[PDB]
Design an enzyme around this catalytic site. Structure first.
Site, PDB file in Angstrom:
ATOM      1  N   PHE A  37      10.153  29.942  29.877  1.00 41.37           N
ATOM      2  CA  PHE A  37       9.521  31.211  30.226  1.00 41.37           C
ATOM      3  C   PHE A  37      10.441  32.415  30.347  1.00 41.37           C
ATOM      4  O   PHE A  37       9.973  33.537  30.221  1.00 41.37           O
ATOM      5  CB  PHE A  37       8.813  31.056  31.567  1.00 41.37           C
ATOM      6  N   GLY A  38      11.724  32.199  30.642  1.00 39.48           N
ATOM      7  CA  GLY A  38      12.634  33.305  30.960  1.00 39.48           C
ATOM      8  C   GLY A  38      13.618  32.876  32.031  1.00 39.48           C
ATOM      9  O   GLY A  38      14.084  31.752  32.012  1.00 39.48           O
ATOM     10  N   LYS A  39      13.940  33.746  32.978  1.00 38.53           N
ATOM     11  CA  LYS A  39      14.913  33.343  33.994  1.00 38.53           C
ATOM     12  C   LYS A  39      14.534  33.762  35.405  1.00 38.53           C
ATOM     13  O   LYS A  39      13.689  34.624  35.600  1.00 38.53           O
ATOM     14  CB  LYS A  39      16.307  33.873  33.637  1.00 38.53           C
ATOM     15  N   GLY A  63      18.354  29.960  37.663  1.00 36.16           N
ATOM     16  CA  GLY A  63      17.549  28.975  36.978  1.00 36.16           C
ATOM     17  C   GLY A  63      17.146  29.657  35.723  1.00 36.16           C
ATOM     18  O   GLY A  63      17.116  30.898  35.673  1.00 36.16           O
ATOM     19  N   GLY A  96      14.782  28.928  31.865  1.00 35.46           N
ATOM     20  CA  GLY A  96      13.564  28.239  31.481  1.00 35.46           C
ATOM     21  C   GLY A  96      13.003  28.671  30.151  1.00 35.46           C
ATOM     22  O   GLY A  96      13.477  29.655  29.531  1.00 35.46           O
ATOM     23  N   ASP A 108       3.055  20.029  36.496  1.00 35.76           N
ATOM     24  CA  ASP A 108       4.489  19.963  36.116  1.00 35.76           C
ATOM     25  C   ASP A 108       5.327  19.726  37.353  1.00 35.76           C
ATOM     26  O   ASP A 108       6.305  20.445  37.620  1.00 35.76           O
ATOM     27  CB  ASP A 108       4.906  21.303  35.453  1.00 35.76           C
ATOM     28  N   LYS A 133      11.655  36.249  39.247  1.00 33.90           N
ATOM     29  CA  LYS A 133      11.398  35.551  38.035  1.00 33.90           C
ATOM     30  C   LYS A 133      11.075  36.581  36.978  1.00 33.90           C
ATOM     31  O   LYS A 133      10.097  37.306  37.108  1.00 33.90           O
ATOM     32  CB  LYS A 133      10.223  34.604  38.260  1.00 33.90           C
TER      33      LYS A 133
HETATM   34  C1  LIG Z   1      15.910  28.798  41.995  1.00 32.17           C
HETATM   35  N1  LIG Z   1      14.482  29.105  41.829  1.00 32.17           N
HETATM   36  C2  LIG Z   1      13.798  28.684  40.769  1.00 32.17           C
HETATM   37  C3  LIG Z   1      12.513  29.104  40.875  1.00 32.17           C
HETATM   38  C4  LIG Z   1      11.562  28.813  39.903  1.00 32.17           C
HETATM   39  C5  LIG Z   1      10.211  29.259  39.979  1.00 32.17           C
HETATM   40  N2  LIG Z   1       9.216  28.970  38.975  1.00 32.17           N
HETATM   41  C6  LIG Z   1       9.562  28.214  37.852  1.00 32.17           C
HETATM   42  N3  LIG Z   1      10.898  27.761  37.763  1.00 32.17           N
HETATM   43  C7  LIG Z   1      11.839  28.041  38.713  1.00 32.17           C
HETATM   44  N4  LIG Z   1      13.088  27.566  38.501  1.00 32.17           N
HETATM   45  C8  LIG Z   1      12.430  29.813  42.064  1.00 32.17           C
HETATM   46  C9  LIG Z   1      11.458  30.472  42.723  1.00 32.17           C
HETATM   47  C10 LIG Z   1      11.742  31.100  43.958  1.00 32.17           C
HETATM   48  C11 LIG Z   1      13.015  31.059  44.523  1.00 32.17           C
HETATM   49  C12 LIG Z   1      14.000  30.379  43.830  1.00 32.17           C
HETATM   50  C13 LIG Z   1      13.680  29.798  42.647  1.00 32.17           C
END
Ligand SMILES: Cn1cc(-c2cncnc2N)c2ccccc21
EC number: 2.7.12.1
Length: 330
Positions: free
Chosen positions: A21-23, A17, A19, A137, A40
């Site tokens: 914010f980053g990845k 994923g 974003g 969100d 994250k």
């Molecule tokens: C695939 N995936 C995406 C997030 C995630 C968390 N916070 C903001 N955006 C996100 N995409 C995430 C958190 C725990 C385990 C798997 C996760």
């Protein structure tokens, strides 16, 4: 940045994923038998660091109150810093509900699955609301399956192979915008298609904005597409009016977004090209129902109640959790 190592134990193997914010990446844990976790990795940029610190304080609080994730918030396992980046280690979940539906060609979820997923979502977010928190969100990209395992059941109506969910249990993720009752409220929250009318009209918001978001989410799960296919504020309102009827006058008088209004009505030409687009893509809510059987009616009755214009009148998640739609779960 795969094959790389963080905190000397987490080897990156894949990106889950991406974003603002980053990845979020999948890591092998070399110090825990090699079993896998999510990490994250936050951008090296103030607004994202503060969101990460804020997220970490929220999760610590939730893990402490509910360390077994009875209320289905994602479990943070630890956090640290690496080349200046905040890194949060989470339990490895499966696909988001968005990615699932996408990979399945935008076929809607079966109604029994929706039932369960909606229950869990409302349980999770109500737990937040009981702790003076608004997620802000909610959307399908932030609802993840615990394990996204399926079977390959052929169906002759669609005449084509589809994926059925072994187990549809979910978790809520992303507490970076989560906001306490007593803290500063951002002016603009939510992703556009899940954004409540009080937010669009800048009237102030609280817990009820998350309920609107959930209403929108359930509609997507049921249809497979959004009922708000827009990227413009005034159009978005025009779509609400088409799906739900006129905005209440007092919300219109309270607003300072005067640009959207003419006299005390939405400044919208139904005969413009945008007007035709709205009329074409949107129509009264209950006209989206695919069946009239009473289970479908109760979903839509809940949906409607979640999509009440006036946040003071909107249904609370406490009430939602006892909605007739949920019975068949006992
Ligand atoms: C695939 N995936 C995406 C997030 C995630 C968390 N916070 C903001 N955006 C996100 N995409 C995430 C958190 C725990 C385990 C798997 C996760």
């Amino acid at each position: 940045q795969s094959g790389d190592v963080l905190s000397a134990r987490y080897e990156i193997v894949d990106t889950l994923g991406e974003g603002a914010f980053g990845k979020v990446v999948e890591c092998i844990d070399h110090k825990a038998g090699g079993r896998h976790v999510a990490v994250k990795i936050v951008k090296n940029v103030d607004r994202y660091c503060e969101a990460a610190r804020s997220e970490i304080q929220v999760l610590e609080h939730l893990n402490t109150t509910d360390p077994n994730s009875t209320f289905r918030c994602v479990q943070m396992l630890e956090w640290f810093e690496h080349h200046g980046h905040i890194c949060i280690v989470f339990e490895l979940l499966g696909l988001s509900t968005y990615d699932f539906i996408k990979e399945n060609g935008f076929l809607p979820f079966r109604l029994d699955h929706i039932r369960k997923m909606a229950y869990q979502i409302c349980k999770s977010v109500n737990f937040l609301h009981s702790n003076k928190l608004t997620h802000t969100d909610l959307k399908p990209e932030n609802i993840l399956f615990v394990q996204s395992d399926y079977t390959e059941a052929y169906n002759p109506k669609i005449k084509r192979d589809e994926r059925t969910l072994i187990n549809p249990d979910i978790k809520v993720v992303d507490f970076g915008s989560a906001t306490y009752d007593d803290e500063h409220h951002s002016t603009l929250v939510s992703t556009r298609h899940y954004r409540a009318p009080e937010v669009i009209l800048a009237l102030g918001w609280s817990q009820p904005c998350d309920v609107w978001s959930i209403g929108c989410i359930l509609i997507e799960y049921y249809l497979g597409f959004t009922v708000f296919p827009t990227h413009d504020s005034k159009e978005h309102l025009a779509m609400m009016e088409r799906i739900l009827g006129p905005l209440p006058k007092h919300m219109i008088q309270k607003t300072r977004k005067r640009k959207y209004f003419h006299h005390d009505r939405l400044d919208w030409d139904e005969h413009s090209s945008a007007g035709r687009y709205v009329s074409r893509r949107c129509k009264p809510l209950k006209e989206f129902m695919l069946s009239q059987d009473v289970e479908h009616e109760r979903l839509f009755d809940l949906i409607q109640k979640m999509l009440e214009y006036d946040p003071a009148k909107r249904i609370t998640l406490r009430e939602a959790l006892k909605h007739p739609f949920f019975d068949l779960l006992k």
